[PDB]
């Protein structure tokens, strides 16, 4: 009974190390893998979350890239919260600060995520407005206590989380908003903040708040990297950077048109967004990269690892046009279930029609 | 023609109010208000951050009773969450609430036990309508930049000099929201609060709200010692407290600043002018014959002439101001000496360390 106990304990540590190692694989940065390892030792599921301003069409980093990450976590003992940050978009002047339009876009985001090929068993969609107003004393008390703990300058270091900067006129809303986002982490009892690296400053503020308050339960920051825009030098795909985005409602022709003229330098993967889509979206989705091409250009070839793919790209074995053509085809295939849903479901088709009539305000 | 009477009345009302007030942001709006066949809503707000000083009881009572007697409601906003946000009473909301309770006991025994006065708790009222309240706070924050809002630091007793926490941006957004949340017609606070009252009127113009609050600011009662332009818990030994005993009052007044011939920033004279003379409609100065003998003052003009000309020595003014303050505090003393439950409450809050 000492050797089966030993074999019971060994098998558990190997499981955790493998669970940790590929939870880390979706990530650009983890603020303490050792703390993540610790948290995966709990019997319970770990609460993870990301949050979204409903501010316009959804681009493929928020749908396609997101679902890969969420699927990895929910198949590894996590629960995942999508926080529909409607009050936040309103505070940040989005959708002309019209909350009815914001909530329409939020419903649209949920329709997208539900047809994204995410396993939904351990996924929840929570609306900021609804949840804050279920427990408004607890929530605003937290907001106020966070505001007392940090000075203004420190909080202005979080402007990037709302797409703002010191350069513009800074409204007091830009102090309230990061206090609220920080409060959300505690309000939602999050174990893992799982947002893009542009949100990291307010996730670090939350850890700092823990030290200030002598809270030992600190959230782990599991940041994912920025999916780049189509054009050279666009580090971040977004509605804000013109011509940078493929959207979740783009048609098969739109995707083909956008990929064709995207930046894809020969022999180079640094700052190459076509390669980035291959590496961050297609390869995790398919677990191989199957490069299809004409016999004239070398026929088809399957890449079973990312190193294989990189090697053949930098040495000119893969021409840019072959890389672009396959990336377009795989993005189109990954968007097929979303397209089907908005063609076959007339309520959802309606809703997409309504939200596309809106004006994208900043 | 009976609106003739209506207009004569209101004009008299307005003249009295402006005299006691230090500044009124638009008499003409206040006149329009006073000519609404409804009850106007007035308010003042207090952080429960320590013992109450005489500006907040004895002086407060004079303007409150003038407004309520004309049909107004006067809300005393017990700003418990604001005190916690402003780091008072060690941020112990339980102590803040006990202080708030003791405030109500003081106010009820110094002239505010009345139908037209409401004692409302900030925490309680915000949590009845939290979506409405916080939506306002957020929309106010969107409307003003950080520099504009830091111009309100004085309303919390803070300055640009010290470390400015984000709580000092949130607090004025919340105090501004209160004005609309409480449907206030007249903000009747000290002049140290005027920056955020002006922000509320600016918010109305930004939002095209035509119902704008009148700001009716009262002047600051000076502290006991030289150059303390404002009595406060903040300056130690600046304050006479509503719970001070007769020996405490006598001790503090004897020690106080009272420059001969000088009325400017002379706190002893300020207490005579702003509290005693309005409360009694006269000032009876008791003195020995060799020092000028007893004299009854029926106007502030004569009191000022006699003081500036050296007819009233500072010791005589002090002895009489102390007598009168003790007289005015007698109903408070009797309440806390007899109402054993108020007695126990005073004994507890006296034991609280005042924090900033
Ligand atoms: N190009 C890209 N590549 C990869 N990830 C991306 C890219 N663009 C955006 N994201 C990620 O999408 C999510 C939404 O983005 P956004 O709506 O801007 O978030 C905000 O405003 C946040 N303050 C919203 C918010 C509010 C409260 C709260 O408690 C949590 C969050 C974030 O995780 C972004 O990092
Ligand atoms: N020496 C003095 N002479 C004459 N009046 C004085 C003197 N000292 C203080 N007051 C006056 O007493 C009252 C309380 O004072 P405080 O508790 O400091 O107020 C604050 O902090 C206010 N932000 C509290 C507040 C919060 C929310 C809101 O919706 C309204 C108000 C104010 O009206 C002061 O002007
Ligand atoms: Cl409400
Ligand atoms: Mg082929
Ligand atoms: Mg009453
Ligand atoms: Mg005599």
Residue numbers in the entry:
A (entry chain B): 12 to 373
B (entry chain A): 18 to 373
The study reports:
Whereas formation of the AMP adenylate requires only Tyr and ATP, the thermal stabilization induced by ML901 required all three substrates (Tyr, ATP and tRNATyr).
Like E1 enzymes, aminoacyl tRNA synthetases (aaRSs) are adenylate-forming enzymes (AFEs). They catalyze the transformation of amino acids into AMP conjugates, and then into aminoacyl-tRNAs, to supply protein synthesis. PfYRS is a Class I aaRS, characterized by a catalytic domain that adopts a Rossmann fold (residues 18–260) linked to a C-terminal domain (residues 261–370) that is involved in recognition of the anticodon stem of tRNATyr. PfYRS contains the two motifs characteristic of the catalytic domain of Class I (sub-class c) tRNA synthetases: “HIGH” and “KMSKS” (70HIAQ73 and 247KMSKS251 in PfYRS).
